[PDB]
């Protein structure tokens, strides 16, 4: 086909995912002579091939003549490292790479320059997609949403913030600063530390900006979804539960808190467990003074704030409660016990009532009411589930009162929504907390694939081409593996019912049901305990050991009624006020939260932003191939290029096509009538190329073939010109030697 | 949707929804007909009363039980009980909700066939299943492994289950039951010159049995002591305020469970059938059947039956092996709670016998699919 | 029943 | 070549001999070929020269008799115009662009050579009539 001497090729390499190569001698039809500093290289039953250098650095990654992982990686690399352009496009999908030191680029003059004009005309930027949302809302009168996704620390929150600053500056009427000032609260309650960075955000946060009929900004409304609350009770090594607990413990030396009798961070069972009481970047006692300012400036009264902190310390002290077993059947609390005593005195509820209700459970039918002892295991489950329920209701209550501080009672014609959510993820131990995140990204990228397919089908209507050239990958067979009536989340929640349940038996029940009944579920070769799911991004392996103990929530209604009974301070009844819901396991409350989130996004036509983290070590403004490839695969950008490469990825206006190729093609032809012959002259068949009404559609490689033959021809022209002017100039040198 | 779970003892209907914590309806499974002349023209008239109606009016009524020893003995009474259960008591249309039904381990197959036919033809429940009660008691008590002694109003049966395998040769059935403690109780109360000779009156006897019976921790001692002098003797109020006074005798009925020689039953007491059941079992399992004894069903509710069992089976077992008895205070319900758990397991959804599959298969399907 | 007992 | 041609070419060759040995350098051979009407490429020049190495190209000397077969071998408008029309479509060419391509593409020349050939051919806009420039440089 084509592989020829002085062509360039990309070679796979262990150190950096691809390396530049030059092809030293032409190919002929199993082994190649290459230069890199010399190696011969080999083929097994062909290497990837490299775009012409003038296209490298081009603005939209779809534009490239050859579309493959090496080219996308390089075009990002050079554009970030040399040119210092972070924002990039693939199709409709913006791609963003955090410069990780600040830049002029976000200033107001750039906001103005991005206002009012097509995002395809201007250079790619977050302002460009924000402006397209702002336009499409008024063009259609359909609400618009923005979806921001990546690894922890990729710049999701800062991308959201700049979209907010854009809306504020375009519309100009304050809501903006209250929205910004909400962030320290939502971090402190909602962010966590993980083995791969601090300040991961373990929930998904949606800001609704609402508009006047003339699209001026009236007010802002906040929602949250997919919160992850196993982290309250349970933490893996070098993890932390939510920051607020550490900030609180750090407070304890200060007189206002003092009556809570907080310990140090190691003291309490919940903060103890992860093993990282101190964090290297943040002075943790210092941070909350910012939280308490943010509460004050956002309309949470000093009356409420101490009630919050009293509830959190309540949770910690509850957690430190210790159970003495009697028997297989029964357990008890030791006769006088300090971490329950202080707990009750914080909350007010009578110690002797809680000591009974923690340890036993009621069950009654109208004739007869019965009280059972429960084992130490179920008592510990109950205690932890109660902690998770208090925490979830506190989170909801704080979000509600922030909403009350953001809302204005003014009426809303449409809204734009800006959404920040953890990206698809893989770590080299995976456990139910991470399995949920991966399943949520399955749904969001169902929506993504169905939308991008629909827009290409519409573009092929707008400029007439048959549908059949389009066909697309769909991830419904995987969601049916996770979410349907015998899916992993269903067999998991079943064993929470089962009389004796354990990871050893749940794994087995999966294998029996799934293992040869599917092609997406596969057993990791050397283990019974793990199982592997072939997500759209990757094969991912999960360890069953975590799931059942994290999975389980049941709060015994007595312990809530006993908390509601408090008269000491009024917040605590106020949380519960607003059943079948109490029985629901975490897996089920997650499925139903994601079904809400999809009910909210399916109402709306999304735009997308993706953020990728250059490097593990937080080095400024430099890039490591070996992460980036993984990130770009986890964004689905690589399946986006692979699908487009299967199609007609490069679009050309007839006018730019004329401009570039006129130097190739002859004056005898004179501008679609020219192309009608010239394209068949140059290229064997229409299968390579479509004529659309105002555009041309090429199968990927062909544009490089054009550029190559154009450059060869122009070199021939320039060579002949030089040699002609040399001939007479040498006749001048002859006349000078005569002189 | 959520299945219905409905349990027919001889002695109660217990019904409610799958995944509910405790049954939504309990009432005695008893049908009463008026026997006397109705005088008052324009007063209400009914051809039958069911449950707490027949309770409220019993003096005027012949009360009869449709179920004798877990066998449904005439079907229109039963049909009328189920009708009252779904429509009046639970207010649920059965067509919308599948149903789960409960049976003693050895009773005739015709019971299952008729119980199926009435469910599909009369109510058109979407799907049905039938479960052996002793299987359900393990679900209720959170165990995979145990021997269950389960004793109802009409039947007592043993089923050993090791690690999810029932073991059918092991399985034993006695007809000592609450009803046939009561039918003895009347006859010995005659020794004190009280007589209770009609079914409405007989239920008063059963209220005596429920309130004042207890099990002798050892029987010859108290039979000597109370006869010598009685502190123990205690006295009960009939519905008209007559006080009647019962001495040694209140233990003598529970003892029939341990000595069917009184009633003239061939068999040995429940302790010796429990031991002979484990002796039928393979010696490998027996160590764990001895530890997980589960008591089930209301006839077990008599105070001290737990400790009388723990004591008396220990004498039969070898000393090296050790005996533990489990009698949670809710055990009367447990056969229903186990059905609440079983009906909600996601794997169970394949288990069910479905209107299409019945309509093709004939009601004999319940033997083939259900067990 | 049908034989050995009344039901 | 006839006797008259051989005499004129030998005389011209001897005029380019700056050492008196009746020889020119390999590196001057191309200059002599162009002065004698040939327009060989550097590849063609090296080929008739025998693809000389830098050292012999700059210092090895050959007389006319060895050059002559090479001149013969080298010896053995509308395309040229279209080639110039490449850089046009008003019939002009930027002086800056022609300078850039001649000094940066192909067998790159020095800025002084390009200035020399381009002197006087561009107008006030900085446009070159390429048909006229081509006729001029072919004369
Ligand atoms: N566009 C940007 N310009 C400058 N700094 C950035 C940018 N994006 C990210 N950063 C830096 O990287 C950090 C991590 O991103 P952030 O959004 O705070 O975390 P997350 O993405 O998990 O919410 C930011 O706090 C900031 O220090
Ligand atoms: N609290 C009690 N103490 C003693 N006997 C009881 C008690 N409750 C019920 N019974 C007796 O047990 C029988 C009912 O038990 P139950 O488990 O409802 O039977 P079934 O499950 O067959 O309906 C009746 O004979 C009743 O007299
Ligand atoms: Mg964030
Ligand atoms: Mg029973």
mmCIF file of C-alpha atoms in Angstrom, chain B residues 100-270:
data_model
loop_
_atom_site.group_PDB
_atom_site.id
_atom_site.type_symbol
_atom_site.label_atom_id
_atom_site.label_comp_id
_atom_site.label_asym_id
_atom_site.label_seq_id
_atom_site.Cartn_x
_atom_site.Cartn_y
_atom_site.Cartn_z
ATOM 1 C CA UNK B 100 -46.751 -17.895 48.297
ATOM 2 C CA UNK B 101 -48.381 -20.768 50.158
ATOM 3 C CA UNK B 102 -47.326 -23.011 52.965
ATOM 4 C CA UNK B 103 -47.777 -26.661 53.868
ATOM 5 C CA UNK B 104 -46.713 -29.484 56.205
ATOM 6 C CA UNK B 105 -44.089 -31.855 54.804
ATOM 7 C CA UNK B 106 -46.036 -35.102 54.287
ATOM 8 C CA UNK B 107 -49.725 -34.339 53.714
ATOM 9 C CA UNK B 108 -51.439 -35.706 50.588
ATOM 10 C CA UNK B 109 -50.638 -34.429 47.105
ATOM 11 C CA UNK B 110 -54.350 -33.797 46.514
ATOM 12 C CA UNK B 111 -53.952 -30.944 48.994
ATOM 13 C CA UNK B 112 -51.401 -29.268 46.720
ATOM 14 C CA UNK B 113 -53.433 -29.903 43.577
ATOM 15 C CA UNK B 114 -56.649 -28.423 44.984
ATOM 16 C CA UNK B 115 -54.722 -25.533 46.573
ATOM 17 C CA UNK B 116 -53.221 -24.782 43.165
ATOM 18 C CA UNK B 117 -56.440 -25.091 41.228
ATOM 19 C CA UNK B 118 -58.355 -22.711 43.482
ATOM 20 C CA UNK B 119 -55.547 -20.145 43.218
ATOM 21 C CA UNK B 120 -55.375 -20.062 39.419
ATOM 22 C CA UNK B 121 -59.048 -20.691 38.548
ATOM 23 C CA UNK B 122 -60.731 -18.704 41.325
ATOM 24 C CA UNK B 123 -58.369 -15.780 41.961
ATOM 25 C CA UNK B 124 -56.065 -15.876 38.897
ATOM 26 C CA UNK B 125 -52.992 -14.989 40.948
ATOM 27 C CA UNK B 126 -50.130 -14.405 38.480
ATOM 28 C CA UNK B 127 -47.883 -17.029 40.082
ATOM 29 C CA UNK B 128 -47.813 -19.387 43.042
ATOM 30 C CA UNK B 129 -45.405 -21.512 45.054
ATOM 31 C CA UNK B 130 -45.652 -23.958 47.962
ATOM 32 C CA UNK B 131 -43.008 -24.368 50.666
ATOM 33 C CA UNK B 132 -42.354 -26.841 53.483
ATOM 34 C CA UNK B 133 -42.615 -24.919 56.758
ATOM 35 C CA UNK B 134 -39.481 -26.365 58.364
ATOM 36 C CA UNK B 135 -37.546 -25.032 55.380
ATOM 37 C CA UNK B 136 -38.910 -21.553 56.090
ATOM 38 C CA UNK B 137 -38.018 -21.565 59.783
ATOM 39 C CA UNK B 138 -34.316 -21.693 58.885
ATOM 40 C CA UNK B 139 -34.658 -18.649 56.648
ATOM 41 C CA UNK B 140 -36.439 -16.916 59.507
ATOM 42 C CA UNK B 141 -33.728 -17.759 62.047
ATOM 43 C CA UNK B 142 -30.773 -16.802 59.852
ATOM 44 C CA UNK B 143 -29.333 -20.311 59.539
ATOM 45 C CA UNK B 144 -28.357 -22.652 56.740
ATOM 46 C CA UNK B 145 -27.946 -25.657 59.028
ATOM 47 C CA UNK B 146 -30.132 -27.078 61.756
ATOM 48 C CA UNK B 147 -32.799 -29.522 62.738
ATOM 49 C CA UNK B 148 -36.172 -27.824 63.000
ATOM 50 C CA UNK B 149 -38.873 -29.120 65.271
ATOM 51 C CA UNK B 150 -42.009 -27.310 64.165
ATOM 52 C CA UNK B 151 -45.371 -27.803 65.807
ATOM 53 C CA UNK B 152 -48.590 -26.085 64.864
ATOM 54 C CA UNK B 153 -52.231 -26.252 65.754
ATOM 55 C CA UNK B 154 -52.679 -29.400 63.690
ATOM 56 C CA UNK B 155 -49.301 -31.065 62.958
ATOM 57 C CA UNK B 156 -45.842 -31.559 64.440
ATOM 58 C CA UNK B 157 -42.961 -32.454 62.138
ATOM 59 C CA UNK B 158 -39.169 -32.718 62.079
ATOM 60 C CA UNK B 159 -37.028 -31.787 59.088
ATOM 61 C CA UNK B 160 -33.219 -31.778 59.397
ATOM 62 C CA UNK B 161 -31.454 -29.433 56.998
ATOM 63 C CA UNK B 162 -27.683 -29.499 56.611
ATOM 64 C CA UNK B 163 -26.141 -26.595 54.697
ATOM 65 C CA UNK B 164 -29.067 -26.104 52.338
ATOM 66 C CA UNK B 165 -29.763 -29.805 51.762
ATOM 67 C CA UNK B 166 -32.976 -31.191 53.175
ATOM 68 C CA UNK B 167 -32.692 -34.891 53.838
ATOM 69 C CA UNK B 168 -36.060 -36.493 53.170
ATOM 70 C CA UNK B 169 -35.549 -39.948 54.740
ATOM 71 C CA UNK B 170 -34.777 -38.099 57.993
ATOM 72 C CA UNK B 171 -38.253 -36.629 58.241
ATOM 73 C CA UNK B 172 -40.832 -37.540 60.854
ATOM 74 C CA UNK B 173 -44.405 -36.458 61.495
ATOM 75 C CA UNK B 174 -46.554 -36.503 64.632
ATOM 76 C CA UNK B 175 -50.168 -35.448 65.132
ATOM 77 C CA UNK B 176 -49.716 -34.281 68.688
ATOM 78 C CA UNK B 177 -50.724 -30.665 68.292
ATOM 79 C CA UNK B 178 -52.369 -27.773 70.094
ATOM 80 C CA UNK B 179 -55.846 -28.965 69.150
ATOM 81 C CA UNK B 180 -55.179 -32.372 70.654
ATOM 82 C CA UNK B 181 -53.659 -30.942 73.755
ATOM 83 C CA UNK B 182 -56.916 -28.996 74.153
ATOM 84 C CA UNK B 183 -59.158 -32.006 73.479
ATOM 85 C CA UNK B 184 -57.264 -33.707 76.308
ATOM 86 C CA UNK B 185 -57.399 -30.618 78.520
ATOM 87 C CA UNK B 186 -61.197 -30.645 78.568
ATOM 88 C CA UNK B 187 -61.269 -34.316 79.528
ATOM 89 C CA UNK B 188 -58.961 -33.873 82.482
ATOM 90 C CA UNK B 189 -60.624 -30.609 83.579
ATOM 91 C CA UNK B 190 -63.664 -32.845 84.010
ATOM 92 C CA UNK B 191 -61.686 -34.376 86.904
ATOM 93 C CA UNK B 192 -62.206 -31.040 88.705
ATOM 94 C CA UNK B 193 -65.882 -30.851 87.742
ATOM 95 C CA UNK B 194 -65.906 -28.346 84.923
ATOM 96 C CA UNK B 195 -67.206 -29.333 81.517
ATOM 97 C CA UNK B 196 -66.795 -27.581 78.184
ATOM 98 C CA UNK B 197 -68.845 -29.312 75.553
ATOM 99 C CA UNK B 198 -69.316 -27.040 72.518
ATOM 100 C CA UNK B 199 -66.831 -25.555 70.086
ATOM 101 C CA UNK B 200 -67.567 -22.010 71.231
ATOM 102 C CA UNK B 201 -66.953 -23.206 74.762
ATOM 103 C CA UNK B 202 -63.913 -25.210 73.632
ATOM 104 C CA UNK B 203 -62.192 -22.031 72.514
ATOM 105 C CA UNK B 204 -62.453 -20.870 76.122
ATOM 106 C CA UNK B 205 -60.489 -23.994 77.019
ATOM 107 C CA UNK B 206 -57.875 -23.001 74.487
ATOM 108 C CA UNK B 207 -57.606 -19.578 76.112
ATOM 109 C CA UNK B 208 -57.002 -21.404 79.395
ATOM 110 C CA UNK B 209 -54.296 -23.508 77.774
ATOM 111 C CA UNK B 210 -52.587 -20.457 76.305
ATOM 112 C CA UNK B 211 -52.641 -18.440 79.536
ATOM 113 C CA UNK B 212 -51.973 -20.973 82.308
ATOM 114 C CA UNK B 213 -50.138 -24.004 80.928
ATOM 115 C CA UNK B 214 -46.424 -24.571 81.515
ATOM 116 C CA UNK B 215 -43.985 -27.474 81.209
ATOM 117 C CA UNK B 216 -42.690 -29.371 84.228
ATOM 118 C CA UNK B 217 -38.905 -29.145 84.338
ATOM 119 C CA UNK B 218 -39.222 -32.570 85.886
ATOM 120 C CA UNK B 219 -42.638 -34.133 86.095
ATOM 121 C CA UNK B 220 -42.726 -36.590 88.994
ATOM 122 C CA UNK B 221 -41.406 -34.031 91.455
ATOM 123 C CA UNK B 222 -44.134 -31.474 90.847
ATOM 124 C CA UNK B 223 -46.784 -34.198 90.556
ATOM 125 C CA UNK B 224 -45.798 -35.165 94.099
ATOM 126 C CA UNK B 225 -45.356 -31.653 95.495
ATOM 127 C CA UNK B 226 -48.468 -29.896 94.188
ATOM 128 C CA UNK B 227 -50.598 -32.882 95.190
ATOM 129 C CA UNK B 228 -49.023 -32.709 98.656
ATOM 130 C CA UNK B 229 -49.643 -28.965 99.079
ATOM 131 C CA UNK B 230 -50.479 -26.357 96.460
ATOM 132 C CA UNK B 231 -49.027 -22.903 96.261
ATOM 133 C CA UNK B 232 -48.872 -23.495 92.510
ATOM 134 C CA UNK B 233 -52.637 -23.829 92.021
ATOM 135 C CA UNK B 234 -54.038 -20.852 90.113
ATOM 136 C CA UNK B 235 -57.477 -19.688 89.060
ATOM 137 C CA UNK B 236 -59.041 -18.264 85.899
ATOM 138 C CA UNK B 237 -62.100 -16.171 84.993
ATOM 139 C CA UNK B 238 -64.645 -17.540 82.544
ATOM 140 C CA UNK B 239 -66.389 -14.996 80.276
ATOM 141 C CA UNK B 240 -69.335 -14.669 82.702
ATOM 142 C CA UNK B 241 -67.121 -14.008 85.731
ATOM 143 C CA UNK B 242 -67.183 -17.502 87.189
ATOM 144 C CA UNK B 243 -63.749 -18.135 88.673
ATOM 145 C CA UNK B 244 -62.369 -21.638 88.121
ATOM 146 C CA UNK B 245 -59.238 -22.927 89.761
ATOM 147 C CA UNK B 246 -56.579 -25.233 88.332
ATOM 148 C CA UNK B 247 -53.824 -26.937 90.293
ATOM 149 C CA UNK B 248 -51.290 -29.564 89.313
ATOM 150 C CA UNK B 249 -53.300 -30.074 86.153
ATOM 151 C CA UNK B 250 -52.069 -27.059 84.171
ATOM 152 C CA UNK B 251 -48.711 -28.791 83.564
ATOM 153 C CA UNK B 252 -50.316 -32.179 82.769
ATOM 154 C CA UNK B 253 -51.362 -31.059 79.272
ATOM 155 C CA UNK B 254 -47.923 -29.869 78.036
ATOM 156 C CA UNK B 255 -46.504 -33.172 79.300
ATOM 157 C CA UNK B 256 -48.587 -34.978 76.666
ATOM 158 C CA UNK B 257 -46.080 -33.670 74.113
ATOM 159 C CA UNK B 258 -43.412 -35.672 75.928
ATOM 160 C CA UNK B 259 -45.592 -38.714 76.763
ATOM 161 C CA UNK B 260 -48.234 -39.548 74.138
ATOM 162 C CA UNK B 261 -49.029 -42.606 76.255
ATOM 163 C CA UNK B 262 -51.534 -40.339 78.027
ATOM 164 C CA UNK B 263 -53.537 -39.749 74.851
ATOM 165 C CA UNK B 264 -52.943 -43.313 73.664
ATOM 166 C CA UNK B 265 -50.810 -42.280 70.706
ATOM 167 C CA UNK B 266 -48.345 -44.978 69.684
ATOM 168 C CA UNK B 267 -45.421 -42.664 69.172
ATOM 169 C CA UNK B 268 -42.711 -41.399 71.465
ATOM 170 C CA UNK B 269 -42.637 -37.788 72.566
ATOM 171 C CA UNK B 270 -41.082 -34.983 70.583
#
